[model samples]
Target chain A: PGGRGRIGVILPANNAGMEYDLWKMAPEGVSIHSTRMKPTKGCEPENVEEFEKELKYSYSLLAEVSDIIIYGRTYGTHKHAHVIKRVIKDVVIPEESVYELLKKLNVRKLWIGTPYIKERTLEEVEWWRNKGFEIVGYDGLGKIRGIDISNTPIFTIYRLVKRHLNEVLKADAVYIACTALSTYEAVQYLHEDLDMPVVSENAAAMWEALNKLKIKAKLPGF
Target chain B: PGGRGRIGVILPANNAGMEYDLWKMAPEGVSIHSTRMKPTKGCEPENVEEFEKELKYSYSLLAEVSDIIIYGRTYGTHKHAHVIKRVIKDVVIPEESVYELLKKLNVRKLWIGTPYIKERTLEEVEWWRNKGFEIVGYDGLGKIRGIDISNTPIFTIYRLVKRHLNEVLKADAVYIACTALSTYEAVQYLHEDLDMPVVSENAAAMWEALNKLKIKAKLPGF
Candidate 1:
C-alpha cells in the first residue's frame, strides 16, 4: 500500500528532532509513522523489565504497517541490543546505523558533537573509541533535558564542531551523536563549511531505514 | 533553516496516523516538527480552560521554529477556535481544511466513512449535514479507542465506503473523516475505483498546511 515504502519509528516521548530530520529526508511516495516511548534519563533502558514491556506494546502498534522499525532511543542498546532485536524484527538502531555509515565511509579519525553533559558526552566518545576509531576531538552543549536538546539551534551544533576546526580537519568525518538534536540544517552547514562528511544519528538512521526499504532517497548532509 | 518550509503539528499523544500521512505528502526540504497533547474523547474541548492552557504550552514548543502549525486534533475548534487562534498564529485546523476543500470542490451530496461507533458517527454525519451538504449515506467501523481507529486496515476503510457504493455514486464526492485513519492508500484506491473526489481529513489538512507555508507539494488522493 505504501507506493515506495513505509518506515516506522519509536522515539522518546520528549524527542522533538528525529521526526523532523526523517520527514525532511524521506523521498516521494515513502511514508514515516512514529510512536513515542516514555522518556528516560540518558535514554537508557535502566529497568529492563519495564522497558521491554513498554517496547513490546509499542512495537505491536507499528508491526502491522511498518516494513522496518527504527528504535530511535539509545536505552538498552548498550548492553541489551539483543533484547531489543529479539522483541522487534527488522529494527534499525540509530547507534548501529551510524556505525555502519562510519564504517562504510572508511572513517578512522572522528570528531564528535553531542547535546549532552560532559558525563554523557564522554560516554559517547568512549563508545566510538571502543569501535576502533580514533577520537580526534569532541564537545557537548552541556544539555541534560530532552526538550532543551531538541531545541538546540543549527549554529550551536555547527559551532560545536567548528570550535575544534583544527582537530576536526584531522578527522575524516564529524559525527553528531544524539537523536534529540535537530541536525538537518546543522549537518548541511557543517558539511558545506568543512567540505567533509558530517553524519548525524537521525540522518544516518533514516538512511539505513530507506536502505532496508530499498527506497532511493538522498539525504542532504550526510 | 528549513530549506522549503517547516510545519509544526500538535497531535493527540496516542495518535498514530497524522504523522504518517503528513510525512508521505511532505515535499523535499519541508520538515515536520510535532508535539503531542494528551488524548481527549471525541477530540472535544470539554474543559475549555485546561484545553487552552495545554494548547498554549504546546504552541510555545513549536512557535520558535514553525512557519505554520496544524492543530491536528479537533479539540476547541468547535466552541473555541478563537482561543486556539489567539495562542497559535498561522494555525490550520484539520476540520477547517476539509471544509475549505469541499467548498472549493463544490461538493453537494456526500457519502462519509468514519472509524468511530454509531453515536460518534452520527455526530460526524450531523456535523456535515449542518454545513449544508446533503448526506447520501454514511457508516463507521464501530471503534472507540484511538489506537484501534489508527490501526484500521486500508481495505477496511475502502470497504466502508464501497459498501455505500449505491449512495456514493449519487454523491459529488466521498468523504473519509478522521485524522486517525491511515488513508494514504485507501484514498488513492477509492478515488480510482469511485472515479470521483475521495477527500480525507489528513490529506486535506496536509494540503492546506502546504498552502499556508507556500510550499508546492502533491497529495495523491484529492
Candidate 2:
C-alpha cells in the first residue's frame, strides 16, 4: 500500500517567480519546495557558464529534500538554446533521472510556445527539431525576453490563443515556455479553451515530476 | 534638463526569488534590472569577503543602468543581518545614495505579518526594535522557509486578516512583509476593511521610488 505521499518541486532560480505562481495553483496537501539555480547574466558564454554552475549548485541544495523536482526555466531562443538544453539535461538527470523517464514515456512529439523574442523562439524550435521531435506547432508572443512575460497580464495570453487557436490545435499537446508568465492560472483554461492538453514550463515540470512519483494529479482549474 | 529616468534595483544574487517578486509588481513605464553578488558558501569570515565582493560587482552593474536604486531584501532574522547590511550600504553609497528605505519608513507602531517562521519573524522584530520602531502586534503564517505565499489563496489571507484585524488595528499601520504574497491586490480592500493604510514590501518600495523620482501616479486597485 502506498503511504501518504508528498511532492517536492525543485525550480531553477531563473524560474523562481513562476514556481511561486504554480504554488498558488497547487492543490492543498501537496508539499512543494523551491530551490534556486544561479542567475544567468545573459546569453553570452560567460553567463551561460555561470547559469550552469548556479543550477548545479541549486540542485544539490534541494535534491535531498524533494521527492520530485519540477524544473522551472525557459531556454533562450538564440545560440544559447543548445547550450541550455544540454546543460539542463545533464544537470537534472542525475538527481531526478529525467532523461530516462522521458525515454520511458516515449514523448516524441511536442508543441512549443515561448515569451522569448522571435529569434530566440526560432532557435528553440530548431533545437527541438534536431532532437527528432516533430515541432508540431510554435508561436511567440513577441515579448522582448522571458522577463517581460512575467509582467504581462493573464488576459493577454488568452487573447493570443483566441487569435491563434487554429495553429496551436494541430499539436498533440502544447508546451508554453517561460516560467515567469502566470501560466498556472491559465493552464486548465488553455487546455479547455483549445480542447487540447497544455503543458507550460511550470506545469510540465510539476506534471513530469508528479508522474515520476506516480501521484496522478490533473492540472488544477480547467 | 533631466535625462530619461531609469531606476535600478540592487539585489543579492541568492535573493533571486525576492527580485522576481519585485519585478512582477513593477508598474508600467518603469524599467528594472538586477545584478548578482557572488554566493558565499557559508556565513564565515571568508564568505563575508566574497559576499562583499559580489555586492560591489552587483552595484557596479546597477550603476551603469539606473539613475536611482532601491535595495530589495531582508536581513536573515537572527545572525547575518548586520554583516549583510554593512556590505550593501558600503557597496551602494559611492555611486548613488542608497536607502534602507524599508527600515527608514518604519513609522513606529506597526502591525506586522510575514510568511517567515516565528523565530525569523522575531528577528525582524528585533531589527525593528533596535531601530526604535514599535511592533505593537504581529503574526507569521508559520510557513517553512521558501514557501510561496501565493500557494495559499487570497482567501486565506483575508480570513487571517479578518481574525487578526483587531490586534492589528491597535497599531498605526499594517506592514505586510514577504514580496511573494500578492498583497498588492488586497491592499485597498484590507485598508478599507481595517480603515488604515496597509504597507507592504513592494508597495513601500514603489511608493518610495516614485517619491524619489517625482513621478505622479496613483496606486492601482487595492
Candidate 3:
C-alpha cells in the first residue's frame, strides 16, 4: 500500500512465475498485485467462453487495486487485446505484453519456443505470424496444463530452446513462451552461451508492464 | 505487498539505481523496501558519526517493515560492516556483498573499477587486498556522489572497463564499485563482447540479499 502505484496482473491460475517476476523487479513505491484466471475446461487455450468468464472475475478483482492491468496468459490473450480492453474499459489488456516487448526489442525473424499443448501451439504460431514476424520455428514441447507447464525446470527450458539451435542462431531473436516456465535466469545462461538476444514471456510481460507504469527496471540477460 | 517476505534496504539518499536493480532480480514473494541513510559530513564517506546517526534513524524506520535490511552504500558501508550490523542488529552492509559474490564466482584475481574519490579508492583496494585477492589495479573515476556516478552511461562503463584490456584479460574477474552505478546489463553486454567475468556493487548486494532470504534468483551476467 505504501508503494508509488500498483500493477494488476490477470494470469492463468497454474502459472507460478508471473507474480514473482513482476514483484521481484517492481520499482520502489510500486508493487504488483495479481489475480488468477481459471479455465473452465482445462489449461489449454481452446475456449473463449471459459477464458472470458474467468477474465471477467479476475479483472473485477484486480482492476480495483491497479492503475493498469495486463493479461498474463500467452495464447489466451494472444489476439484478443482489443476485446479485453473494450470489455474492461480503460484497463490495459488488449495489447499482449509479449508483443509489446517484442516490438520494443525490435525483433524481426524470431525462433519461437513453447511448452504448450500441440493444439494451443497452432493458435500461438498463427497469433505471432500475423504480426509480420518471420517465424523460424515453433518447437513446442507438445505438453499442456499446470502440472507440466509449471514443473518445467530451468535446465529443461535451456535444452528445449537449445534443441532449436538451427533457428535460434539464425533468427534475429529467440522468444520462449509461457509464464510458469522458468526463464529470467535461464535466458541469462542462454544468451551467454549462445551470444544471441533471448526473450522469454515472463521477462517481456514484466518489462512491458513496468514500461506502462513508466518505470525503468534495469536487470540482466533480457 | 503480497510477497512471502520483505527485504529492507538502507541506501544512500542520492542513489536511484540500487533499489531498481535489487527489485529487478529479486525472487518471488520476497520484495524490497528502502530507507536512505544521510551523511553528516556530506556525500563522501568521511563522516562516520553522521552516517551512523542516520543509519540508526533510517534502520529504525525500515526495521519495522522488513525481516532483513541491507546497508546499500558502496563506500559508506565499505569496511564498516561490524559496526553497522551491530547498530542495525541483523542487517547487510555493502562491501561484503561484493566480496561474497566474488567467492561464489571463484574470482581470486580481480581488476577493479570505482567512482569514488582517490581517498576512498585507496581504502577499497586495501579492503580487497586483505582478503587475498590480487589487486590487479584500482581504477577510480575520481568522482563524488550521484551526479557523475548516476550519469555514467552503460557504454561509458563498457569503455571504462574496456580501457583496461590487459588486466581484464588476465584477472579472474572484473569488479565495478558504487551502489548508484549501473552495470548488470552493461556486464551482460561486456561479457558478451569480452568474455570476462564481471560484478557490480548493486548486483552482488542483490544476490546476497536474496541468498539471505534463501530465494534462488538466477539473473544474467552475474
Which candidate achieves the best TM-score against the true structure?
A: 1
The DockQ score of candidate 3 comes to 0.02
What root-mean-square deviation over C-alphas does model 3 reach?
14.5
**Of models 1 and 3, which has the larger TM-score?**
1
| Tens digit of per-residue lDDT, candidate 3, span A84-153 | 7665765544236567767877888888888877787777787788999998887777775553565566
List model 2 lDDT by residue over A67-151, tens digit each.
Answer: 5545454434234546444544422221123223334446466667767777988976886667666777777788763334655
True contacts kept of each: 0.14, 0.00, 0.00
Q: Encode model 1's per-residue lDDT on B91-165: one tens digit a residue.
A: 899889999998999999999889888998999999899999999999999997766787788899999999888
lDDT of 2: 0.53
| TM values, all candidates | 0.68, 0.50, 0.49
Candidates ranked, most accurate by lDDT first: 1, 3, 2
Model 1 alpha-carbon drift over 4 Å, by segment? B1-17, B23-133, B136-174, B180-199, B203-222
Model 1 interface CAPRI class: incorrect
RMSD of 1: 6.2
Worst 10 residues of 3 chain A by lDDT: A35-44
What lDDT does candidate 2 reach at residue A177? 60
Query: What's the ranking of the predictions by TM-score, best on top?
Result: 1, 2, 3
Q: What's the lDDT of the predicted structure labeled candidate 1?
A: 0.83
lDDT of each: 0.83, 0.53, 0.67
Predicted complexes: DockQ each = 0.18, 0.06, 0.02
- Predicted candidate 3 versus true structure: per-residue lDDT over B1-222, tens digit per residue: 314666777655445556556766666656565544433353345666865775676566555446677777654554466668778876676568778888888888888888778887887788788888997776777787463575566777788788888777888888888877756577788777767667887777777767777777775465
